[PDB]
């Protein structure tokens, strides 16, 4: 409990590099939730679901003699997989977790996307993304393709990131460290008030 509370506070106190603090400026809750509704269609298979599918396909192809199923469209996920898609420019949009314990891992992800000029978005909750995949940490998931029906509302999501970062690269702390400290804020108010009273009284009389 001691260490976990300190970690967020110390992010402010030390100067935070240009790659970070681009984070914390996260996607809106309204935008995030409607994104997940699109992903409701695309959700990846469970352990049971994949195993089940094999039985259906095996039966159909052997007995029915039917030609193979339609090409599956799902979100693609996992660090090494998704990052490769950014390079090839296959991914239209990637959704990137705010969190992740090795912060070194995830600084690369918006950085690479920005460099190649592929739109990305940073949403809060690594767990929230992970729920969709029905696993653990996804870290990233992305849409390489989208259905024609989903395409219209998908445009809103693409716009969404450049409706909180239609900006050049703000490289946060020039030298600044701190963020405001509870005791210091109270002290500053008292000091300011004394100064203001003195200054005003010279002009007045």
């Amino acid at each position: 409990v001691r260490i976990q509370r300190q970690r967020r506070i110390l992010k402010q106190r030390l100067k935070v590099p240009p790659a970070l603090n681009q984070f914390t400026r996260t996607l809106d809750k309204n935008l995030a939730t409607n994104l997940f509704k699109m992903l409701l269609k695309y959700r990846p298979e469970d352990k049971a679901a994949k195993k089940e599918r094999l039985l259906k396909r095996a039966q159909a192809e052997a007995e029915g003699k039917t030609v193979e199923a339609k090409k599956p469209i799902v979100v693609k996920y996992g660090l090494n997989h998704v990052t490769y898609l950014i390079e090839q420019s296959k991914a239209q949009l990637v959704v990137i977790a705010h969190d992740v314990d090795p912060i070194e891992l995830v600084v690369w992800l918006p950085a690479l996307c920005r460099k190649m000029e592929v739109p990305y978005c940073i949403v809060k909750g690594k767990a929230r993304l992970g729920s969709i995949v029905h696993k653990k940490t996804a870290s990233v998931l992305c849409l390489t393709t989208v259905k024609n029906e989903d395409k219209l509302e998908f445009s809103k999501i693409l716009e969404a990131i450049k409706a909180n970062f239609n900006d050049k690269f703000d490289e946060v702390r020039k030298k600044w460290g701190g963020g405001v400290m509870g005791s210091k804020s109270q002290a500053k108010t008292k000091a300011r008030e004394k100064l203001l009273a003195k200054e005003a009284a010279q002009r007045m009389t």
Binding site: Q6, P17, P18, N80, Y84, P102, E104
Partner: protein, 194 residues
Amino acid sequence: MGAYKYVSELWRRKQSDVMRFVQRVRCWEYRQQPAIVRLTRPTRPDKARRLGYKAKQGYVVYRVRVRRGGRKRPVPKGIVYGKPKHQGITQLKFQRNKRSVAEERAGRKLGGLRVLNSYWVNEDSTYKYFEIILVDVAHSAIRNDPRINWLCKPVHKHRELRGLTSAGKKYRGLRGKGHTHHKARPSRRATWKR
């Protein structure tokens, strides 16, 4: 590859950017915590995998804390009897690297697991931190994996204490390969200084 490439490049530059920022905060947390912290995530996933990482049961990553400094030689102010060329306490240094020291100490506590290799996860000013790969021999998955089944072998039991680890090779002068390195190779005691 992916972020594996990026994190490697970050960790070159200890004093700079994300690498300094994140790890500086984390090493302060480590001081508060014991010298036994098992973690379920690798700090460096790049160098876990370049020292042998398969994520799969029986595999663990673990943190070791071993001090910074020189050497301590017992009984100061009651100093050694002998000619003054060997009089020294802090003048002397260990000839083991601290990467291997972390392995020996970790293996002492975790005798039911066997050290593969170890790597560096920074320092402060009085403690030096390492994360060490230990992988069980007693769990089934290692035996039924043919890329790590060599570890199971009785010969590799407590290999860290015998200095046969990656770290143990480097301090033993096996860093080179040919001439000049020649007096280290199969043993320092090979010719036995005859």
